[PDB]
Amino acid sequence: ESYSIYVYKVLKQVHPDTGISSKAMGIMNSFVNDIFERIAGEASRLAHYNKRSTITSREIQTAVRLLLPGELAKHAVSEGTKAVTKYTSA
Amino acid sequence: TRSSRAGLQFPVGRVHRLLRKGNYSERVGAGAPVYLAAVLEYLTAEILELAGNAARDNKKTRIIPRHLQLAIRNDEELNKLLGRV
């Protein structure tokens, strides 16, 4: 239904002793959904610009580099590429 | 499980389902939801890190909305990313 439990699991890694209120968890869910929609929409247009019928990790990466500022873009690219490399190793 | 193979906590299967259901393209490559789930997880961590720091500076034991607001506004990059949400 939402990302709350996964947000909580990430919270337990970054700040194990810190809780989160129900209202703040609602805001976090709003941020994740908004970022999801922004990247997927941009990857959709890029695949259209490239005359490709499929959204691949190439379009996700390009959307990420163009939508996020500065250091966030660099680290998000590092994290996405690491996940894909682990995933395809398996 | 897809998320475990990618080393992620975020649900790759659901991100895949949401990419397919949203009529973003005709097809979705297997790597696309992995990459995207990884980016969402990282962005979540960065927000919680700074909101968590604000709660601790506030001598508080949990993150509340005011801590998220503080974290976004006082971080140039998160403010650029989310300041319009």
């Binding site: 909580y8 809780g19 209120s21 129900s22 703040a24 | -």
Partner: peptide
């Protein structure tokens, strides 16, 4: 003075 905050906005409980 934190169960007062809990009344206003309850803590997210994963279980």
């Amino acid at each position: 003075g934190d169960s007062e905050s809990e009344i206003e906005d309850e803590t997210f409980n994963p279980s």
